[PDB]
Structures are given as C-alpha cells and as structure tokens.
Design an enzyme around this catalytic site. Structure first.
Site, PDB file in Angstrom:
ATOM      1  N   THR B  15       0.821  -1.205   0.000  1.00  0.00           N
ATOM      2  CA  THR B  15       0.000   0.000   0.000  1.00  0.00           C
ATOM      3  C   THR B  15       0.857   1.258   0.000  1.00  0.00           C
ATOM      4  OG1 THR B  15      -1.613  -1.264   1.304  1.00  0.00           O
ATOM      5  CG2 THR B  15      -2.037   1.084   0.981  1.00  0.00           C
ATOM      6  N   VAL B  16       0.538   2.182  -0.902  1.00  0.00           N
ATOM      7  CA  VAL B  16       1.217   3.472  -0.955  1.00  0.00           C
ATOM      8  C   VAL B  16       0.261   4.611  -0.604  1.00  0.00           C
ATOM      9  CG1 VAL B  16       0.942   3.391  -3.457  1.00  0.00           C
ATOM     10  CG2 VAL B  16       2.423   5.119  -2.427  1.00  0.00           C
ATOM     11  N   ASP B 133      11.368  -2.950 -12.103  1.00  0.00           N
ATOM     12  CA  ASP B 133       9.908  -2.921 -12.064  1.00  0.00           C
ATOM     13  C   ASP B 133       9.362  -1.581 -12.548  1.00  0.00           C
ATOM     14  OD1 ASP B 133       7.566  -4.300 -11.726  1.00  0.00           O
ATOM     15  OD2 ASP B 133       7.346  -3.800  -9.597  1.00  0.00           O
TER      16      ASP B 133
END
Lengths: 237, 261
Positions: B15-16, B133
C-alpha cells in the site's frame, strides 16, 4: 570535476553543529567525547576495521549529539552504536553487537545496542552513507602528480592525521573535505621536507586543493596548522 | 509525526498511502516494508540499500523522486517496519495519458517525456542502480511537465516482505538476470504504450508474456513485423530497445543521442 559537486552537497547535508555542547548537551563535555572517540579508535584498530569505519562513526556521533541530549552515562553506548552502524555500512564482515559489548567490559548489552541503533538511524533519517575524509583523500589523490608508491605513503600518513582529528573538536567545525585537504597537505609537505627531490605535489598544494574544493586557501592553511599542532600533543601519548 | 489522507493504491510494493509534512506542508508518499529483527538488529542489506538511496538525493537529479525521510518503527522480537517517506507527484503517467486530447499525442510531448524518462534512467544506471519494475503507475509527472521516476532499487528492499508481468524483459524471469538492460526493454514497452495508450505484450504467464514477444521480434529454446503508429526513427529506435540479446541492446545514454533526437 563533476561528481565532487555531489560529495560537497552530501557532506553539507550531514553536517553537525559546532555548538551542540552549549546548545544541546548538558552532561557531555569535549573531554568525554575524546575519551569515547579514542576508545572507538582502539576498537577499530584492535579489530582491523576498514579505515573508513572510525571517521564515519564519529560522523554519526557528532550528528546525533547535535540533535539529542545524551547522559554522560549513555555516551559509551552511543559510541558503540555508531561503530555498529558505521561497520554495517563499510565492512564485508561488520562488527557484531556482542563484540562491541565485550569491549565495554560488558557494561552494555546487545539489547541496549539494538535499541540505540534504531534511535541513531532514525534521528539521522537513515542518512548513513555520509562522506568521510577518506572519500576525498582518494579524490584528491587521483588528481595528483604522484607515483603509486608515493600515493600509498601519502595515504597512510593522511589517514593517521584524519584519525587524530576525529578524536578532536576540529572534526565538528571542519567538513570532511577540509579535514582531508589539510591532512593531505600536511602529509605531502612533511614527506617532501624529508626528501626534497620527491613528493613534489607539495608545491602550491593548498591552493591547488582549494581549487578542487572551491574554498579559501587561508582556512585550509588554518585547518592544516591545527592538525600539525594537534599532532604535537600526540607524541605526549 | 506524519498523518495520512489517501492511497495511491495497492502496488507491487504494498500500500502506498499519502500524507502531509506538518511544518513543510507538501504532500508525501508513504510506503512500508517489513524486515526481520535479527540478533544483529537492523538487517545489513536494509540499512545499506536504504542509505544508498537517501544518498542519491545529494545529486538533485530532477527526473527522480526524492526519498526525503525514512523511519523504522515496529520492534517485535522478530520484525521491524520501515516507513519510506517519498516526494509526491499527484498524477502518474497512466492518468496523465488518458487525459490527452485524442488521438493522444503530438510527439513534442512524447519526444520530451521520452527524454526526461531516459535521463532519470541513465542517472540511476550511473549509480549502479537497476529499476527492474518500471511502470506508468510509477513514472509520475508533475503539474508542470517534469517526469519523475518512481520506485527504484526497492526490489532489493522488499525481498523479505515479498517473500504484473506486463513489462519484464526477456531476461526476467526466464532467468532472473536483474541486469541493467532490463530497464531498456521496459522503456520500449512503455515507449509504445504512449502511442497505443496500452500494453503490447501484456497479460498471462511468462510463457505467453514471452510468447507474445517472439511474434514481433521473432540464446534460444523450443516453443511456438513493425506495425507502427507513426514514426520510422521511432521504430528504428524502439526496436533497438526491444532487441532480444541484452548485450547487443541500446543504452539509456545511447538512446538519448539517437537520430530520433
């Protein structure tokens, strides 16, 4: 000529206060910081640490004392923690918390240490990859007209000088680039002073390294004088 | 202390959320990572990798987000929670491309975002960093036009807590390479998505994901053209990017100096 801008920036981000003794600290005096520093030094030497470990540690210790009151009784525990983290940053085989504690005659415990580590790193905002004077000595060294033979001798002597400055309040006032300049200058002078044909980079080195650093050569001569005097007190020992 | 008030979402790295810096006011992106609380306290790798990334801030390179603070918290006998405090862009790429005036161009928006993009990417590679990524979820863009790369090197942090194939190069995960050219592939993948506005070679397992690629492009194995939406040099280049062999493959530096300007 290019990546040095970044070393000069970084260095400035991780700069301690020259007034922390008066403004932050209450129990801790310079005399103690020296007792702890030279303890830290003897640990690094005993343990054959990477040369950059001690000065980086004292970097941490001055930056933390610049943001936290510490009890003179928790001071050796702060030294220890700073060596612990420095070592993790610069060593293939870092110091164990258990072995640091052994050098305090077990007056602390790995648990105390691990608690401090989190404090110290959090207070430093995990800004642990700081510039030591060794990063510069090597930058300076690589811009100098010197055979490797000479370079490794100058490098030994400067590292001596650096360690010496670290145990001393100089280290708080002068940024690592200065400390490294004065050290190289001192080293290369003395070496040429003994062998006048040799070590010719001695010539106008102060101004030359000021050019590299972008600063006033008066400070560098001032800083250098201090190292040489401070070394005169080191024979006494 | 920091206080949260949104969530950019659930990403590859958990979660950001989003908070404010009380005194400074600015918006902050908060991430986290669980690491093991060993008998040596903070795990070496974490101290080192984290610090290597704080250091980067010293360069002040505009095409990269700023890790501004880091804070460890949890001290259970067996875990630590390290809160990463980042610089916040409000809109990432994906949102920013949708927007775009159909057909969603011109090129002097792409050409210059592909430039800003390649800059922050060469810089990282200069500091021995690979992204691995690379996504448009990441490639944030300021309300001012500056692209700012997003979640770099964090792969080596999240190794613990981790224990979208859309963009991975042929090297991954066919092996695990984690080389530096891996980012030059995912540049060509994002390169096209700027046009088509979504992923060529997207979806499914490594097999299909890597199968889809041998359709266009053609070390070896044993299973199973251009189709351009406006430019030649953009194809001449995007195919130098999307070369199979990472060695005979373009560099973020080379790229920036290609006839495509």
């Amino acid at each position: 000529d290019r990546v040095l801008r970044a070393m000069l920036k970084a260095e400035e981000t991780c700069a301690p206060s020259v007034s922390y003794f008066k403004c932050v600290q209450k129990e801790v005096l310079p005399s103690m910081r020296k007792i702890v520093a030279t303890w830290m030094l003897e640990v690094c030497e005993e343990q054959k640490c990477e040369e950059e470990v001690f000065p980086l540690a004292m970097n941490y210790l001055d930056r933390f004392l610049s943001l936290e009151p510490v009890k003179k009784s928790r001071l050796q525990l702060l030294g220890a923690t700073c060596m612990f983290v420095a070592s993790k940053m610069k060593e293939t085989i870092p110091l164990t918390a258990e072995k640091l504690c052994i050098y305090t005659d077990n007056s602390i415990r790995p648990e105390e240490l691990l608690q401090m580590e989190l404090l110290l790193v959090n207070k430093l905002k995990w800004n642990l990859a700081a510039m030591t004077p060794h990063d510069f000595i090597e930058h300076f060294l690589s811009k100098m007209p010197e055979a490797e033979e000479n370079k490794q001798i100058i490098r030994k002597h400067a590292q001596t000088f650096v360690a010496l400055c670290a145990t001393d309040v100089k280290f708080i006032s002068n940024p690592p680039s200065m400390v490294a300049a004065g050290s190289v200058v001192a080293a290369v002078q003395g070496l040429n002073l003994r062998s006048p044909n040799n070590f010719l980079s001695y010539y106008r080195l102060t101004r030359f390294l000021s050019r590299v650093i972008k600063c006033d050569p008066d400070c560098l001569r001032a800083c250098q004088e201090q190292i040489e005097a401070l070394l005169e007190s080191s024979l006494r020992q | 202390r920091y206080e949260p008030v949104a969530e950019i979402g659930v990403g590859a790295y958990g979660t950001v959320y989003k908070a404010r810096d009380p005194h400074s006011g600015h918006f902050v992106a908060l991430k986290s990572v669980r690491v093991p609380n060993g008998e040596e306290g903070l795990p070496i790798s974490t101290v080192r990798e984290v610090a290597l990334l704080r250091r980067l801030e010293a360069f002040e390179h505009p095409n990269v987000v700023r890790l501004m603070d880091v804070c460890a918290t949890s001290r259970t006998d067996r875990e630590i929670k390290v809160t990463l405090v980042f610089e916040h862009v409000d809109q990432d790429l994906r949102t920013y491309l949708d927007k775009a005036p159909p057909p969603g161009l011109p090129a002097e928006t792409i050409k210059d975002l592909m430039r800003q993009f390649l800059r922050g990417l060469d810089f990282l590679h200069a500091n021995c960093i690979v992204h691995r990524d690379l996504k448009p979820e990441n490639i944030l863009v300021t309300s001012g036009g500056t692209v700012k790369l997003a979640d770099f090197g964090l792969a080596r942090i999240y190794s613990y807590q981790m224990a979208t194939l859309w963009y991975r190069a042929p090297e991954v995960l066919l092996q695990s390479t984690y080389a530096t050219p891996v980012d030059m592939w995912s540049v060509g993948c994002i390169f096209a998505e700027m046009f088509r506005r979504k992923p060529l070679f997207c979806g499914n397992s490594e097999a299909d994901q890597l199968g889809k690629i041998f359709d266009l492009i053609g070390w070896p194995r044993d299973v199973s053209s251009v189709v351009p939406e406006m430019e030649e040099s953009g194809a001449q280049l995007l195919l130098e990017m999307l070369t199979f062999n990472p060695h005979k493959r373009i560099s973020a530096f080379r790229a920036l100096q290609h006839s495509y300007l």
